[PDB]
Design an enzyme around this catalytic site. Structure first.
Site, PDB file in Angstrom:
ATOM      1  N   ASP A  35       0.823  -1.207   0.000  1.00  0.00           N
ATOM      2  CA  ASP A  35       0.000   0.000   0.000  1.00  0.00           C
ATOM      3  C   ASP A  35       0.861   1.264   0.000  1.00  0.00           C
ATOM      4  O   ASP A  35       1.380   1.668   1.044  1.00  0.00           O
ATOM      5  CB  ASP A  35      -0.929  -0.024   1.223  1.00  0.00           C
ATOM      6  CG  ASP A  35      -1.808   1.202   1.324  1.00  0.00           C
ATOM      7  OD1 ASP A  35      -1.946   1.930   0.322  1.00  0.00           O
ATOM      8  OD2 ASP A  35      -2.388   1.412   2.412  1.00  0.00           O
ATOM      9  N   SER A 199      -0.711  15.605 -12.075  1.00  0.00           N
ATOM     10  CA  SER A 199      -0.966  15.209 -13.446  1.00  0.00           C
ATOM     11  C   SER A 199      -1.194  16.453 -14.295  1.00  0.00           C
ATOM     12  O   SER A 199      -1.707  17.469 -13.803  1.00  0.00           O
ATOM     13  CB  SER A 199      -2.194  14.291 -13.513  1.00  0.00           C
ATOM     14  OG  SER A 199      -2.558  14.008 -14.847  1.00  0.00           O
TER      15      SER A 199
END
Ligand SMILES: O[C@H](COCc1ccccc1F)CN1CCCC1
EC number: 3.4.23.22
Length: 330
Positions: A35, A199
């Site tokens: 994770d 992004s």
């Protein structure tokens, strides 16, 4: 040194991925959920409330000759999805795919929430975010990666998740045969303890690319892709019959649909998530309404590039002094 381990979807929907991890002497192999959105290595154990264990493999420190109780140390974690666990702490030898760390903090669960109990395939979590998020008190502990870093050939790990198929976690090297084209690296902020990046935009299907900054985290422990409401609305508007259902808890669409792809930007590069990756199947057994793999982050407070996005790429988690993230197509 290096390590290389195969990671396998737990079910037919890729709801999560498990990777075998050797703990203790002699080795006890548990299947952990790697994770990158948390920083605790915790396991079901001989100390876990019996009623809260249902099929999981447990770690028994009393059977390990290298296990030592970390005196006075406790941990307690609450994840973004409402799940939680807590307990005591041991140090022991931990190995992943041939890479060995001695004196790793292994957090033994005394309590786990229902969602963990109900998932018999996941024996615990191995956190790979920054150690500043580790919940051990009163002395915070280091992640497996943080402990291994100095010994690694290169201070990196890579995630190569499969779509309905096995994939690979590598430590200490980049497998140049595992991706196509080049790896595009992008800046990381560690201020919140996550692999947080920006992004450069998105496209829906064959549509034009929209240049727009989208801050978010790269999180292998989150199944879906959580993005701003404007982005998510634009995606689902291209699917006939798709709608946001408050009763179900997100966007649903007709199971008969063929979904458009979703493209996200990494610098000047583009990662394309095929439409099929975005289909998470019937909302309930036998339903013709299917759950979407792209959902709004509005209720969360952060955008999350989870498995839906990450499995479309070869992803480099560069833990150099100034961390960065790399993405390649594959
Ligand atoms: O905590 C992650 C999921 O985080 C995003 C999220 C999804 C759904 C509702 C709320 C949220 F914040 C799940 N991981 C599973 C293993 C550890 C956490």
């Amino acid at each position: 040194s290096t390590g290389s381990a195969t990671t396998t979807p737990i079910d037919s929907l890729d709801d999560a991925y498990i990777t075998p991890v050797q703990i203790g002497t002699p080795a006890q192999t548990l299947n952990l959920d790697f994770d990158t959105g948390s920083s605790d290595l915790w396991v079901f154990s001989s100390e876990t409330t019996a009623s809260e264990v249902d099929g999981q493999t447990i770690y028994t420190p009393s059977k390990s000759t290298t296990a030592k109780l970390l005196s006075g140390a406790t941990w307690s974690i609450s994840y973004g999805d409402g799940s939680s666990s807590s307990g005591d702490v041991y140090t022991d030898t931990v190995s992943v795919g041939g890479l060995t760390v001695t004196g790793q903090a292994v957090e033994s669960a005394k309590k786990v929430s229902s969602s963990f109990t109900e998932d018999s395939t996941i024996d615990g979590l191995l956190g790979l975010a920054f150690s500043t998020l580790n919940t051990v008190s009163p002395t915070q502990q280091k992640t497996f990666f943080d402990n291994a870093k100095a010994s690694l050939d290169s201070p990196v790990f890579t995630a190569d998740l499969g779509y309905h198929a096995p994939g690979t976690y590598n430590f200490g090297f980049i497998d140049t045969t595992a991706y196509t084209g080049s790896i595009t690296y992008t800046a990381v902020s560690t201020k919140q303890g996550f692999w947080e990046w920006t992004s450069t935009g998105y496209a829906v299907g064959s549509g034009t690319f929209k240049s727009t900054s989208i801050d978010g985290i790269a999180d292998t422990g989150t199944t879906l892709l959580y993005l701003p409401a404007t982005v998510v609305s634009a995606y689902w508007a291209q699917v006939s019959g798709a709608k946001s259902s408050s009763s179900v808890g997100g966007y649903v669409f007709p199971c008969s649909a063929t979904l458009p792809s979703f493209t996200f930007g990494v610098g000047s590069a583009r990662i394309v998530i095929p439409g099929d990756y975005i289909d998470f199947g019937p909302i309930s057994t036998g339903s013709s309404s299917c759950f979407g793999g792209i959902q709004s982050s509005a209720g969360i407070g952060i955008n999350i590039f989870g498995d839906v996005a990450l499995k479309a790429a070869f992803v480099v988690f560069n833990g150099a002094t100034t961390p960065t993230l790399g993405f390649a197509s594959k």
